[PDB]
C-alpha cells in the first residue's frame, strides 16, 4: 500500500525480510541451458519468479572498413507487457534499455569473447551475435537475471567452422564445431537493495527493490576484475560500506559461478 | 518422414505460470512455446478487448530483432478477432482488457499454439468468456495426390501443399477464426480441414480444460 | 444571375445581404460559389451543395451521436449540429428515453446565433422512430410545410425533414415497442422499394414532394423490377415521372 | 510543459507601439539585434547569438558510399533541433508545424543554393564519396529564429575542417598527423535568412521580430539571398494580403541586409582564423568567462593527492576482511542440490 | 470441487446463479473459471455459481464510515484518499477519490480548511451522499470523535492533541490547527 | 452510424429476400473496371463498386528477386488508404485496412501460385521480374474489401509488361513492341459472406454490414479453386452453417467472376485504338 | 530546350496548358474536384463545416477550423518511392495547403466548425502544387462553402533570360527556376507565395509578373469551367 513504507521496514530494522530473508539471499536460481534448439545458444533463468532467458542467435556479416577483421556481438534486452502488466503497450521502456546496453557494456567490459574469433574471413566475414534476453516474470533484480541468463545462454552456443572456396562460402551445419562458445573470463552481476541509512538488502524484489532508495550492481571477472559497477545514485555511500557489497558480492558469485559449473556435466549432457 | 493421418504431438501445458500478470497461459508442442500474459478491465458503450502478437528475436535459426509490425500486425489481429467472441463485454462497459502473447517458439502450428496459450490467461486470469477457444494446426502433404495431414511440424508446415490454421470453441461448437491461404483443392475439397477441424478441439478439449484447472487448483489450495 | 464567388452586384442605397453575399471595400462581393438571387431589399446567392439551415418551427429527424448528463446530442448534416435536452422528451432517464444512435424526430425551437440548431419533442409526430429507412440527400431537395405531413398511397407513409433527410415507415395500427416486431412481407416490398424510387429524382437533380413522390412511384407502373438500376432504368423513370407529373401544368 | 502566458494590454499595446512604427526594444524597424558568434575549441563548432536567440552548429566528416543514381556527386546532410530548454512549450514532440515547415524550409535554400560543392569531396566517385551533416540546435529560443539559423549553419559550414592524407588506387588512408594541414571546403555560396514580420494587414512591417513580437505578427515572410544579390528562396506565411509590389521592397530590403550579415561572418570567420595562427584560444566562449558576474574560471593545483591514497587498505581491509569468510557458506546453498 | 468454463452441471429447473453464471436454452454452463460453489436458498432449491477468489468487491457503502488520507488542500475545498470503509475493506479500487466541504467539515465553528486537515496526514470521517456525476463521494468530520488523526512536525515528528483544533510535537514546538 | 431501431429490418429484411434497394438476397449492382487510366505504368483499373473507387496499378523491375528463391519473380503489393477514402481515417488511420488488405491481397496471390513466377524471372539468381501492384480507394459502398478482389485482377489482364531483351549491360525496349506481357486467369479473387441472421450475403451496403459480427473470406479462380480464405468477425459462427457460405463461394463467386472475368476483352475488343 | 517562340513543352511560354477538371465528382462528401494541369493529376475533396468531429479537443470558437491532408500516387511520379516515409515534403507541402484557404475561406462564420481538405496526386506532372490549390479550391467551390475570392495558383520559370508561366515537369528539372503564389484576383493579393530558385534579385518584377498574370488567366479559365456547372447543374 502507499502505506506499509516502514512495514517492510519492520522486518528490516529487526533485519528479515517479509520473503524471508535477510543481508544477502540468492534464492531461487535455476537454469535451463540449450532449453531452446532453435538457437544455438541460450539459457534461461528464473529467480524468484522472473524469467530472463537468453535467446541467442547467430549470423553472419562483415567487419567494419575501420575495425577491419572483428568480430560481431549483439545484444538486446527487452520486456513486454508480459512480466509486468505495469509496462507499456509499444517500444522499448526507460529502463528497458538501460540494461540492454548494460549487458553490452559489460559484454564489453567483460572481454568474455574476443572479437578475433568472430571473423568469418579476417576482413570480409564476421561472426554476428543477437542475445536476445527477455523477462518472462518481473520482479526483483531484472539486472542479474540476465548476467546468468546470458552468461549461460553463451556457453550453450556452438557452431560450424568458416571456409572460403574460389569466391564462395563454405559452412556446413554437420560442419566441425569447435570452440563454439568459450570465453577466458565469465563474470557476472549481482544487485543489492539499499535504504537510505545504507541498511540494504541484496537480489532485491519487485516490491523490495521497489520502495527501495538505492540499486547498485556490481560484475567482477573470476579472478575479481571489477567489471563495472552500477549506481544509478544510491542515496551516498563509503567505500567500506561498498567494501562489504565488494567482498560479499563475490561470494554470491562463486555461487552462481557453481550454479552454472553445475550445469556442465549434467543439464548440459542430459 | 510421416505419422499418422491425425496423430498429435504431446500436450503440455501448465498455466498461471505468470505471476506478475492476472491471467496466465503457457504451452508445449514438441517444439512450441506461447505465453500469455493478459491484464485486467480498465477504461480507455461497451468496451471490448485488446489483444497483441509477437515473436521471440530468436524464434527459429534467423534473428527478427524489431518486432515486425505487419507480421504481428496480422496475427495479433486475427487472434483478436478469433479470441475475440469468446469473452463477453457487457461486464466491462467503458472498459477493455488486453491480452499479450509472445512465441519463444513455433513448432509449425505455433500459429494455434497462440490461440491456445492465450485462452489460458483468460480465464486462469478469470474473465467473462463464455466458451474456450481452440485452435490447431491442419496441413496437405506434398504428397503426389491428395496427401493430407493434421498440424504440422516446423519441418513440417514449411513443404505444405497448402496452408491454413483455424480454431472454434468445443462445448459449443464455434467457429473461432478459421485462416487459410489456399493453395489446393476446390471450394469443396477444403472440408478437407474443416471437418478435420472439429476432431481437435472436442479431442485437446480435455486437456485444455484439465491443465487449466490443476493450477487454479494450486492457486485455489493456495489461499 | 449567374456569378462566380468573389465578383460584384448592382451596388445601391437600401441594399442588404443573404448568406453567399457581403460588402467588401465599399462594395458587395459573392463569398459563396453560387448563383445570383434577388428578393425585395435583399440580395443573396443560391448554392449547389450547401448544409443544413432551416426556418421558424421545423421538422427533421436526427441520427444521435453521444449525449451528456444534461442534453442529448443528436447529428443533423449541416454546419450545425443538433442537440435537445431534457426539456420535451414526451441522469439514467435520458439512457432509456434516447438510446445511443437512433433516429428521432423533432421540433425545431430555434437555432441562435449561438451556431447550433436545438430540438423539443411532443407527439410521434415529433417521436422517437425505428424500423430502418432513412434517406441522405442534399437539403436542397425540399419543398414546403403545406404539402408536407402526409401519408400517401403506396402500401407505407414517408415523412422527410427539412434538411436532405427522409425516413420511410409503415402505416400505422391504432410509443417505442410498435415496431419491435418484425412488419410482413407485404410492407416490406412497399418501402425497399421506394428506397430506389426516391434517389432517381435526387440523381435527377428533381424536388421531392407529395404528389412528385407520387408520380415517380405511379411511373413504377412498367419496370417495376423494384431494384432500379440507378443509370438505366432511373435515366427513363424521370422522363416519364415529369412526363405524367408536367403534363398535370403545362 | 508550462504555457508561456500573454496578456491582453501587452499583447494590444505591443501592436499599439507598432502602430506607432516605435520597435518596443526600441530599436527602428529594419535592424537586427545585435548578433554575436562564438567558435568552438575544435573545428566545425560554432554559437550564435541574434541576441537572445541561441543556435549550435556543428558539422560531421564521412567516407560513405554515394547513393546509386549520379554515383558521382556525393551527399549532404543537415538536421534543426528544438530543444526543451529551447521554449518552455517546447516538450520535445508536438511542434512539428516548425520543426516541420522550419528544419525543411530552411533546408530548402541549403540545395537550393548548391552552394556547397557535392564533386570535391566525392574521392572514389560510384565507392567512396563524402558524407557532410550538419546540426542545428536551438538553446534558448528568442524571436527570429530561422536567420540566426542560417546563420548558424553558414557560420558553421566555413568552420568546419575535412581530413585528407593519401588514397592512392583503391585504398583510403588518411592520418590525424598529415590531417594537420589538409582540412577545408567547398562553400561556393554563402545564403541567409531575412524574415519580415506583418502587423494588421501587413500595414506595418518588422525584421527579426522578437519573441514577443513573434507573438504579435499577423503573417510573416523569408527570403534567401547569396552574396551574389541572388535569391535562393522565399516563403510565405501566416496569411497575408502581400502585394506583389510591396512584395517587392522586402526582397530589395532583404537584399540589403544580408549584405551587411556575410560581413560578419567573414569578419569574425577571420579573425578566429587569426587567433589560432598566433597567441591561440580556441574553447567555446571565454567573453561570457571573464565578463564580470555570473561566470568564473580558475585552475587549481592537485601532496594533498597522494597523501590519503593510502587509506584505501583502510577502509578496504578494516570492512571487507571479515566479510570473505562467509563464502564458504554460499558455495553449498542453492548449487549442490539443483541438479533436478 | 473445481469447474472449468465449459462443463454444465444443473438448469432452470432447480436455481439460478449468481456466480460463474452462463446460460444458454435452459441448461447450467459456467462462465466464469477457477472454483465451484453452490447455493441453497429459502426455498427448496439450490443457486448454482461458480467461486469469486475475489470474495472482496466494491462495498463502500452510502452513509457509512470511512479511514482515508488527505491529498491535495484547497483553502476552499478538500481532497482524499480513502481506503478503509471500515476494515473489512482494503479495496484500492475507488483509492483515494472523495470531498468534503468546509460546511461539513464540522457542525459548529467556521475554520478554514487550511486550518483542519492538512495534505499530508490521514483522517477519519463518515460519508455523505453520493452523486457519481463526477466520480466524487462526500464525507463529514462533523463529529466529537470524528475529524482527522494523524500528526506531522516541522522537524518530522509525531504530533499529539492538545486541544479540539490542535496538534503538537514534543521535540520542537508547533501550535498547529488541525480538527482533531 | 449504427442504429438498433433500424438495425431490425436491416436483419430481417435480408431473411426475407428484401435487402433493401429492390434486392431480393444475393444481388449484386453494376460493377465495371475501366482498364489502364494511369497513363504512368502497366497494369491499371478503376473498378467503382456501388459507392466505392479503387486504383491498382504495376511496373516493372529487374535483379534480385530475393535470396531463397533467386531464379523467380514474386509480387509485391504496396496498398494505400485515402483520406478522401475514410472521412474518419485521417493520416495515422491508414495503416489500419492499409496493411491489413495489404496483407489480404499479398497472401491470396502469395500461395495461389497462379503467379508465372516463370513469365517473371531475368537472369535467374542475377535477375528477376518485379511488378509492384499498388492500390488506392477513394470511397466505400460497402463490400468495398471485394472491389479490391476485382481492381486487383481487372488490372492485371491489362498488365502489358513491356517486350525487354537484355544483353550482357545493355538493355532494349520497344515501346511499339508490347509482347512480353504476362497475363492468365489462374488469378485468384475475393468472396465474402457476413451474416444478417441466417440469410448471410455478399456484397451487402456498410447499412447492412452494420447487422453482423463477422463474415467468410474466400477465394476462387477462374473457374473453383480455392485461395486464401478465412472467417473474419469479432463474433462466432457454427461449422455445419460454415461449408454452406464456403460453397456460396464456388457457387456464386463464379457468377459475375465469370462474366467481369470476360469483360477484360469487351474493352479490348471495341476499341483497339478507339478506348 | 525552348526557343523562336516555342517553348520545350511545345508552347508559348506565355500560354498555359490546357486543362480540363471534373468538379462534383463523387457525391459522397460535399466539396469535390477532378482536375490535371496537362498531364499532372489530382483529386482533393473538402467535407463541409461539420461540427469538431475526432478528439473533441482543441476546437477554435471565433472562427472554423481547417485541415488538408496531402498525399501523392507512388507511380504518379517518374519511379515509385515511400509515401507515408518519405513524409517530410507532403507535410510540409500540407501546411501550405492549409494557409491558403485558412486565409480565404471565412472560418468566421463556422465557430468551432471544422472543415477539413484533403488532396491527392494522381499523375505527377509540375507545377504540382498549384494543381492542388486549384484542384483543392474548386473541391471547396463545389462544397459551396463561402470565401472571399476564387483562387488559383501559377507557376512562374525563368529560363533563357525569359519567363516561362507554368514550368510542367521537364522545365522544373531545368536550373530549378521556379516561383510560384495562390492569388486572389478579387483585389490580386498574394495569399500564398513559394519561389525555390537561384534567381538574382531583379528577375522578379519579371518573373514575379509572369505567375501573377498567369494566376488571372487560370482564373478565367476555371471561372468558365465553373460558371458552367452552375448553369448545368441548375437543372
Given at each position: ?165 574460389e569466391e564462395t ?102 | ?223 | ?250 | ?64 558510399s554515394p547513393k546509386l543514381n549520379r554515383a558521382t ?51 572514389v566517385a560510384g565507392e ?213 | ?180 | ?34 482498364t489502364d487510366?494511369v497513363s504512368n505504368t502497366s497494369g491499371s ?11 491498382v496499378g504495376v511496373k516493372a523491375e529487374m535483379g534480385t528477386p530475393k535470396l531463397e528463391k533467386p531464379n523467380e519473380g514474386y509480387l509485391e503489393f504496396f ?30 496471390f502469395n500461395?495461389?501460385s497462379s503467379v508465372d513466377l516463370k513469365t517473371l524471372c531475368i537472369s535467374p539468381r542475377e535477375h528477376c521480374w518485379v511488378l509492384y501492384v499498388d ?20 488490372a492485371l489482364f491489362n498488365t502489358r509488361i513491356p517486350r525487354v531483351r537484355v544483353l550482357e549491360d545493355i538493355e532494349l525496349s520497344d515501346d511499339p513492341y508490347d509482347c512480353i506481357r504476362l497475363s492468365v486467369?489462374n488469378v ?88 | ?73 507512388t507511380f504518379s511520379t517518374g519511379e515509385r518511392k515511400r ?90 528539372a ?62
Open positions: 500500500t502507499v502505506e506499509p513504507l516502514e512495514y517492510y521496514r519492520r522486518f528490516l530494522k529487526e533485519n528479515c525480510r517479509p520473503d524471508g530473508r535477510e543481508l544477502g539471499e540468492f534464492r531461487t536460481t535455476t537454469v535451463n541451458i540449450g532449453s531452446i534448439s532453435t538457437a544455438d545458444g541460450s539459457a534461461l533463468v528464473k529467480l524468484g519468479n522472473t524469467t530472463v532467458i537468453c535467446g541467442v542467435k547467430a549470423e553472419f556479416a562483415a567487419p567494419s572498413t575501420d575495425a577491419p577483421d572483428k568480430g560481431y556481438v549483439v545484444p538486446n534486452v527487452d520486456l513486454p507487457p508480459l512480466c509486468s502488466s505495469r509496462f507499456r503497450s509499444g517500444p522499448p521502456g526507460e529502463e528497458a534499455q538501460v540494461a540492454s546496453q548494460f549487458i553490452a557494456d559489460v559484454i564489453e567490459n567483460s572481454q568474455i569473447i574476443q572479437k578475433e574469433d568472430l571473423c568469418i574471413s579476417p576482413g570480409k566475414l564476421v561472426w554476428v551475435l543477437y542475445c536476445d534476453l527477455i523477462c518472462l516474470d518481473y520482479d526483483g533484480n531484472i539486472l542479474d537475471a540476465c548476467t546468468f541468463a546470458l552468461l549461460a545462454a553463451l556457453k550453450n552456443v556452438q557452431l560450424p567452422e568458416v571456409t572460403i572456396n562460402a563454405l559452412a556446413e551445419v554437420n560442419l566441425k564445431k569447435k570452440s563454439y562458445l568459450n570465453i577466458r573470463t565469465h563474470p557476472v552481476a549481482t544487485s543489492f537493495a539499499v535504504f537510505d541509512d545504507t541498511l540494504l538488502i541484496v537480489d532485491p524484489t519487485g516490491e523490495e527493490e521497489h520502495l527501495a532508495t538505492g540499486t547498485l550492481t556490481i560484475v567482477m571477472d573470476e579472478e575479481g576484475k571489477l567489471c563495472c559497477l552500477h549506481k544509478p545514485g544510491g542515496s551516498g555511500l563509503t567505500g567500506a560500506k561498498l567494501q562489504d557489497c565488494m567482498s560479499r558480492a563475490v561470494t554470491r558469485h562463486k555461487e552462481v559461478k557453481k550454479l552454472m559449473d553445475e550445469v556442465i556435466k549434467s543439464m548440459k549432457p542430459k | 518422414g510421416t505419422r499418422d493421418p491425425t496423430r498429435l504431438r504431446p500436450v503440455y501445458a501448465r498455466a498461471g505460470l505468470l505471476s506478475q500478470a492476472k491471467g496466465s497461459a503457457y504451452l508445449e508442442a514438441g517444439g512450441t512455446k506461447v505465453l500469455c500474459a493478459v491484464s485486467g478491465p480498465r477504461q480507455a458503450l461497451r468496451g471490448r478487448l485488446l489483444c497483441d502478437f509477437r515473436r521471440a528475436p530468436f524464434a527459429g535459426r534467423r534473428r527478427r530483432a524489431p518486432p515486425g509490425g505487419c507480421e504481428e500486425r496480422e496475427l495479433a489481429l486475427a487472434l483478436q478477432e478469433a479470441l475475440e467472441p469468446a469473452v463477453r463485454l457487457g461486464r466491462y462497459p467503458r472498459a477493455q482488457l488486453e491480452v499479450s502473447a509472445l512465441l519463444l517458439e513455433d513448432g509449425g502450428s505455433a500459429l494455434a499454439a497462440a490461440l491456445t496459450a492465450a485462452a489460458l490467461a483468460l480465464a486462469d486470469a478469470g474473465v467473462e468468456m463464455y466458451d474456450l477457444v481452440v485452435g490447431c494446426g491442419l496441413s496437405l502433404a506434398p504428397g503426389p495426390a491428395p496427401t493430407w495431414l493434421l498440424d504440422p511440424t516446423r519441418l513440417e508446415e514449411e513443404r505444405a501443399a497448402a496452408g491454413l490454421t483455424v480454431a472454434l470453441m468445443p462445448v459449443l461448437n464455434q467457429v473461432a477464426g478459421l485462416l487459410g491461404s489456399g493453395e489446393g483443392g476446390l471450394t469443396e475439397s477444403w472440408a478437407e480441414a474443416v471437418r478435420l477441424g472439429l476432431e481437435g478441439c472436442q479431442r485437446l478439449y480435455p486437456v485444455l480444460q484439465q491443465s487449466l484447472v490443476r493450477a487454479a487448483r494450486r492457486r485455489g489450495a493456495a489461499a | 444571375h449567374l456569378v462566380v464567388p468573389g465578383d460584384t452586384i448592382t451596388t445601391d442605397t437600401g441594399f442588404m445581404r443573404g448568406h453567399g453575399t457581403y460588402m467588401g471595400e465599399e462594395k458587395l462581393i459573392a463569398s459563396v460559389a453560387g448563383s445570383v438571387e434577388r428578393v425585395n431589399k435583399l440580395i443573396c446567392v443560391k448554392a449547389l451543395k450547401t448544409r443544413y439551415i432551416g426556418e421558424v418551427g421545423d421538422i427533421v429527424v436526427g441520427r444521435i451521436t453521444e449525449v451528456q448528463q444534461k442534453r442529448w446530442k443528436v447529428e443533423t448534416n449541416s454546419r450545425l449540429d443538433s442537440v435537445l435536452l431534457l426539456s420535451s422528451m414526451n441522469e439514467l432517464a435520458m439512457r432509456g428515453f434516447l438510446q445511443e444512435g437512433d433516429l428521432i424526430s423533432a421540433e425545431v425551437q430555434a437555432v441562435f446565433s449561438d451556431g447550433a440548431v436545438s430540438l423539443h419533442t411532443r407527439s410521434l409526430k415529433y417521436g422517437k422512430l425505428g424500423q430502418g429507412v432513412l434517406v441522405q440527400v442534399s437539403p436542397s431537395l425540399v419543398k414546403r410545410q403545406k404539402t408536407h405531413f402526409h401519408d400517401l398511397p403506396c402500401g407505407a407513409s414517408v415523412i422527410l425533414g427539412n434538411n436532405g433527410f427522409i425516413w420511410i415507415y409503415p402505416t400505422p395500427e391504432h410509443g417505442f415497442i410498435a415496431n419491435l416486431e418484425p412488419v410482413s412481407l407485404a410492407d416490406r416490398e412497399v418501402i425497399s422499394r421506394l428506397r430506389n424510387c426516391i434517389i432517381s429524382l435526387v440523381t435527377q437533380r428533381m424536388m421531392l414532394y407529395d404528389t412528385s413522390i407520387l408520380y415517380c412511384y405511379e411511373a413504377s407502373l412498367p419496370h417495376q423490377i423494384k431494384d432500379i438500376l440507378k443509370p438505366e432504368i432511373m435515366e427513363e423513370i424521370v422522363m416519364e415521372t415529369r412526363q405524367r407529373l408536367l403534363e398535370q401544368e403545362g | 510543459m508550462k504555457e508561456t502566458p500573454l496578456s491582453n494590454c501587452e499583447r494590444r499595446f505591443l501592436l499599439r507601439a507598432i502602430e506607432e512604427k516605435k520597435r518596443l526594444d526600441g530599436r527602428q524597424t529594419y535592424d537586427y539585434r545585435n548578433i554575436r558568434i562564438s567558435f568552438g575549441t575544435d573545428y566545425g563548432c560554432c554559437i550564435v547569438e541574434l541576441g537572445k536567440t541561441r543556435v549550435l552548429g556543428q558539422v560531421s566528416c564521412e567516407l560513405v556527386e556525393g551527399i549532404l546532410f543537415f538536421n534543426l533541433e528544438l530543444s526543451q530548454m529551447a521554449a518552455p512549450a517546447f516538450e520535445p514532440g508536438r511542434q512539428s508545424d516548425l520543426l516541420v515547415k522550419l528544419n525543411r524550409l530552411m533546408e530548402r535554400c541549403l540545395r537550393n543554393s548548391k552552394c556547397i560543392d557535392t564533386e570535391s569531396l566525392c574521392v567512396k564519396v563524402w558524407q557532410i551533416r550538419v546540426d542545428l540546435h536551438l538553446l534558448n529560443h528568442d524571436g527570429n529564429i530561422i536567420d540566426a539559423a542560417s546563420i548558424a549553419a553558414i557560420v558553421a559550414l566555413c568552420h568546419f575542417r575535412r581530413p585528407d592524407v593519401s588514397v592512392q588506387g583503391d585504398e583510403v588512408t588518411l592520418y590525424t598527423p598529415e590531417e594537420r594541414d589538409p582540412v577545408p571546403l567547398s562553400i561556393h555560396h554563402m545564403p541567409i535568412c531575412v524574415s519580415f514580420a506583418f502587423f494588421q494587414q501587413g500595414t506595418y512591417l518588422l525584421v527579426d521580430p522578437n519573441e514577443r513580437e513573434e507573438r504579435v505578427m499577423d503573417g510573416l515572410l523569408v527570403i534567401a539571398m547569396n552574396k551574389h544579390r541572388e535569391i535562393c528562396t522565399i516563403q510565405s506565411s501566416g496569411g497575408i494580403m502581400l502585394l506583389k509590389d510591396q512584395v517587392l521592397r522586402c526582397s530589395k530590403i532583404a537584399g540589403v541586409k544580408v549584405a551587411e550579415i556575410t560581413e560578419l561572418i567573414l569578419k569574425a570567420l577571420e579573425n578566429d582564423q587569426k587567433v589560432r595562427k598566433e597567441g591561440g584560444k580556441f574553447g567555446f566562449a571565454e567573453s561570457i568567462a571573464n565578463q564580470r558576474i555570473t561566470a568564473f574560471k580558475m585552475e587549481k593545483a592537485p601532496x594533498x593527492x597522494x597523501x590519503x591514497x593510502x587509506x584505501x587498505x583502510x577502509x578496504x581491509x578494516x570492512x571487507x576482511x571479515x566479510x570473505x569468510x562467509x563464502x564458504x557458506x554460499x558455495x553449498x546453498x542453492x548449487x549442490x542440490x539443483x541438479x533436478x | 470441487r473445481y469447474c472449468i468454463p465449459g462443463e454444465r452441471l444443473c438448469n432452470l429447473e432447480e436455481g439460478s446463479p449468481g456466480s460463474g453464471t452462463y446460460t444458454r436454452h435452459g441448461y447450467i454452463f459456467s462462465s466464469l473459471a477457477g472454483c465451484l460453489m453452490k447455493s441453497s436458498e429459502n426455498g427448496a432449491l439450490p443457486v448454482v455459481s461458480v467461486v469469486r477468489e475475489t470474495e472482496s468487491q466494491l462495498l463502500p457503502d452510502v452513509g457509512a464510515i470511512v479511514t482515508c488520507k488527505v491529498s491535495s488542500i484547497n483553502s476552499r475545498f478538500a481532497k482524499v484518499h480513502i481506503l478503509y470503509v471500515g476494515s473489512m475493506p482494503l479495496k484500492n479500487s475507488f483509492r483515494g477519490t472523495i470531498r468534503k466541504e468546509d460546511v461539513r467539515a464540522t457542525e459548529k465553528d467556521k475554520v478554514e480548511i487550511y486550518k483542519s486537515f492538512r495534505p499530508g496526514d490521514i483522517v477519519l470521517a463518515k460519508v455523505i451522499s453520493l452523486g457519481d456525476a463526477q466520480s466524487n463521494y462526500l464525507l463529514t468530520t462533523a463529529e466529537n470523535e470524528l475529524g482527522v488523526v494523524v500528526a506531522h512536525s516541522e522537524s518530522g515528528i509525531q504530533m499529539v492533541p492538545i486541544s479540539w483544533c490542535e496538534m503538537q510535537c514534543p521535540k520542537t514546538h508547533t501550535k498547529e490547527f488541525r480538527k482533531v | 452510424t449504427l442504429s438498433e431501431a433500424e438495425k431490425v429490418y436491416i436483419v430481417h429484411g435480408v431473411q426475407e429476400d428484401l435487402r433493401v434497394d429492390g434486392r431480393g438476397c444475393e444481388d449484386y449492382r453494376c460493377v465495371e473496371v475501366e487510366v483499373a478503376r473498378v467503382k463498386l456501388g459507392h466505392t473507387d479503387i486504383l496498398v494505400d488508404c485515402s483520406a478522401s477514402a475514410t472521412p474518419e481515417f485521417e493520416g495515422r488511420g491508414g495503416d489500419d485496412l492499409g496493411t491489413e488488405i495489404a496483407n489480404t491481397l499479398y497472401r491470396i500461395n495461389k492500390v488506392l480507394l477513394l470511397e466505400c459502398g460497402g463490400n468495398l474489401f471485394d472491389a479490391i478482389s476485382i481492381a486487383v485482377k481487372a486467369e485468384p479473387c475475393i468472396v465474402t459472406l457476413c451474416k444478417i441472421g441466417y440469410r448471410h450475403v455478399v456484397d451487402a451496403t456498410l447499412q447492412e454490414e452494420a447487422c453482423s459480427l463477422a463474415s467468410l473470406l474466400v477465394s476462387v479462380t477462374s473457374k473453383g479453386v480455392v485461395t486464401c480464405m478465412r472467417k473474419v468477425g469479432k463474433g462466432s459462427l457454427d461449422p455445419e452453417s460454415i461449408f454452406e457460405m464456403m460453397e456460396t463461394g464456388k457457387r456464386v463467386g463464379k457468377v459475375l467472376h465469370a462474366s467481369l472475368q470476360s469483360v477484360v476483352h469487351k474493352e479490348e475488343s471495341l476499341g483497339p485504338k478507339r478506348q | 530546350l525552348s526557343d523562336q517562340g516555342y517553348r520545350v513543352d511545345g508552347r508559348r511560354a506565355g500560354e498555359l496548358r490546357k486543362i480540363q477538371a471534373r468538379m462534383g465528382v463523387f457525391a459522397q462528401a460535399d466539396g469535390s474536384a477532378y482536375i490535371e494541369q496537362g498531364n499532372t493529376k489530382a483529386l482533393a475533396v473538402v467535407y463541409g463545416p461539420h461540427e469538431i468531429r475526432g478528439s473533441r479537443a482543441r476546437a477554435l470558437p471565433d472562427r472554423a477550423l481547417v485541415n488538408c491532408q496531402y498525399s501523392s500516387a509515401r507515408p516515409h518519405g513524409d517530410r515534403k507532403s507535410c510540409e507541402m500540407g501546411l501550405q495547403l492549409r494557409q491558403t484557404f485558412e486565409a480565404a475561406i471565412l472560418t468566421q462564420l463556422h465557430p468551432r466548425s471544422q472543415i477539413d481538405i484533403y488532396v491527392q496526386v494522381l499523375q505527377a506532372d509540375g507545377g504540382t502544387y498549384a494543381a492542388c490549390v486549384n484542384a483543392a479550391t474548386l473541391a471547396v467551390l463545389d462544397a459551396g462553402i463561402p470565401m472571399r475570392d476564387f483562387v488559383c495558383a501559377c507557376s512562374a520559370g525563368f529560363v533563357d533570360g525569359t519567363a516561362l508561366a507554368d514550368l510542367s515537369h521537364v522545365e522544373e531545368a536550373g530549378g527556376p521556379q516561383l510560384a503564389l495562390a492569388l486572389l484576383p478579387a483585389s490580386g493579393q498574394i495569399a500564398l507565395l513559394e519561389m525555390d530558385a537561384r534567381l538574382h534579385e531583379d528577375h522578379l518584377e519579371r518573373v514575379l509578373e509572369a505567375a501573377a498574370q498567369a494566376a488571372r488567366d487560370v482564373h478565367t479559365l476555371l471561372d468558365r469551367v465553373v460558371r458552367q456547372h452552375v448553369r448545368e447543374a441548375s437543372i
